[PDB]
Amino acid sequence: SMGVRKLATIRTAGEITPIAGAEAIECCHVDGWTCVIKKGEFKQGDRGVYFEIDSFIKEDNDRYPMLSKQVIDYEGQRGTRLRTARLRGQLSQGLFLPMDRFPELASNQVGDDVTEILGITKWEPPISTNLSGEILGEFPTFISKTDQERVQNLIPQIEENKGQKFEVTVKLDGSSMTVYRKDDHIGVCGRNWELRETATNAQWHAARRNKMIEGLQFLNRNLALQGEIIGESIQGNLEKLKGQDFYLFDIYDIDKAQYLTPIERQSLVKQLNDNGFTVKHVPILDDLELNHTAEQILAMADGPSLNKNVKREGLVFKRLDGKFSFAAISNAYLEKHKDR
Template sequence: MRKLATVRTVDTIRPIPGADAIECAVVEGWTVVIKKGEFAVGDRGLFFEIDAFLPLDDPRFAFLEKSAITWNERRGVRLRTMKLRGQISQGLILPLSQFAEIDALALADPALRQRDWAALFGVEKWEPVIPACLSGEVEGAFPSFIAKTDQERIQNLPEVLAAGDAHVFEVTVKLDGSSMTVFHNAGALGVCGRNWQLRETAGNSLWRVARQDRLLEALATLGRNVALQGEIIGEGIQGNPEKLRGQAFHVFDVFDIDRSSYCGMEERSALLDLLRELGATVRTVPLLEVTTLDRFGGSMAEVLAFAEGPSLNPACAREGLVFKRLDGGLSFKAISNSYLLKHSDR
């Protein structure tokens, strides 16, 4: 689960050319525009990540009123990636002194320093409205025996870069669509969106594509308790940024239900090949390369620059990249800043 409101430290501050009232802070991997003089290097503040929805009934967020929207019947502000005076800004950091609810002494406890304070301040994760063709009729909650797909952003894992990890990672293109899971478990078959298991209905795109690609039949024949997880993209989904005709499911992970862990690259590829032999049409997200993190020299900026580039459709810019260690033990995403700026309405 993403941590939307955390106590973080200001690592560096630098001026923004031509700006008198604002400056740029680097906050543990994130670049944020702040009021000039509001923070010094080493100060701690409450940091709100992009896509946090801040309620305007809390007067501490009232200065954001001009960006107000109504979402889930609440009036508030969704934090987005933006550019101010030519400087990318992602998130919001406010002085801890504004949040008396947080016991400063308790923050000496490392466990509490990692706490997500979002619920305390009524902060929620903003989610786009799901089209009817993807939401469908709910069969039940997302299965507890399958991990949800939610990659951490590299900005929240600066220690991974700093460690100079020699492990090898596969780097794949992140497609901008909607989360989809198809599973077989103990004889039962199912299809899920991001948060719910869905009932098969004529108008549901996820079930239609799963049937079209013969994924359910192949999984039943294979007999292993596994879940295929990926992205459904195309017409009617997130504005169809790939400019595709129709809809298609692209697998990015295979979750082994019996082991309760993700398959590594080699095992995943072998299993998907078996499904193809059993008659399924299996598409995967594009593989860019296999590499180590040493190539970035510990630079967050280099990783984010690498996230820029063409997507599945080479005429379209990609949303970003996903890095997965070959053994399946660690993964994270790097989102293209230019893509976030272009699609800030989502």
């Protein structure tokens, strides 16, 4: 998905195959996903509404009776969190429903995002106190969010980018943080909002400890430093840090409205650190020239994290021109850490 967008989309049923023994269900490929459907629901080529994992579907027995015994109470409301599943060891991800359940979507084309009209939201794990700040204002409209699309949703784009080169980085499991300068203002943001400085806010504390506000003034440009804050009290602290710290993965050029290329970003990190502004960067793996299937890419996702004895959330791929990127999440990670 793209943040809170594209949780529910119109998609085309792919290859459908029988499931061993179970006479009432079958396996349906939907883009790079596989999920269990009931017999009678689809033939290959049919449209359906595909709800991606992490969708939260509020209880509705008329529309979603197949979820009635999967409901939890989440943020004060009964509904179902879609999660990675297995049936006799076979991977199933997401929910694929045929169009007869959605007569009001009959004019929607393949590719349409129907998240809002269906009221689908994204499930999120609990956030610790110091990662929720005093809201200064909106996330700046002149800075891109840090959302990354999943490789499973990019099958044609993977072929379109055959032969292109990518920076491969470890996907750290923390919270997205943006520190930016635009003319006479420097701000600190979390995932969704710009935050006021307080003595206990974790994003501001990380920005202050690494001097990245003075670093932005030194660079004297309109830039957004975007990174992951990880460590104690954040997302289970996979890396076993003491304390917290910021790990850069992108720099947004505000005036040009584009990301710096990986090489441009490496040079700015070097300039920052060489001048006393200690900014760390997410782990960088070998570059990849793309000549791969989604399946091969997903088989790259598991591996050592920043802490090499823990298994990483996955990988992010950023094309060397800065203009195309995606994430490959480790399915083993999704099945191991079921509470986030």
